[PDB]
Amino acid sequence: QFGRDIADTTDAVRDPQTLEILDITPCSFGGVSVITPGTNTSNEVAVL
C-alpha cells in the first residue's frame, strides 16, 4: 500500500483509485533569521 523511510516515516503511497505510485515529500519549511546592523546604525534588515 505504502512506502516508509529509514526512520519509519511515510514516504510513498498507491492512489486508492489508480495503482500509480506517488511519493510524499514534506512541504518546504525552515528558520527565518534576521541579519541586522545594530539599531544604533540602521533600521534596514535582510532576511535569511
Ligand X SMILES: *[C@@H]1O[C@H](CO)[C@@H](O)[C@H](O)[C@H]1NC(C)=O
List the one residue out of 1, 36, 33, 35 whose CA is nearest residue 15.
1
Contact 48, 32 (CB under 8 A): yes
Q: Identify what 17 binds: ligand X, other proteins, none; CB under 5 to 8 Å per kind.
A: ligand X
Site for other proteins in 5-44 (CB under 8 A): 6-7, 9, 12, 26
Nearer CB in complex with other proteins: 7/48: 7
Asked if residue 48 binds other proteins (CB under 8 A), the reply is no
Beta bridge partners of 4: 10
**42 binding partner (options other proteins, ligand X, none; Cβ < 5 to 8 Å by kind):** none
Which stretch of DSSP H or E encloses residue 2?
strand 2-4
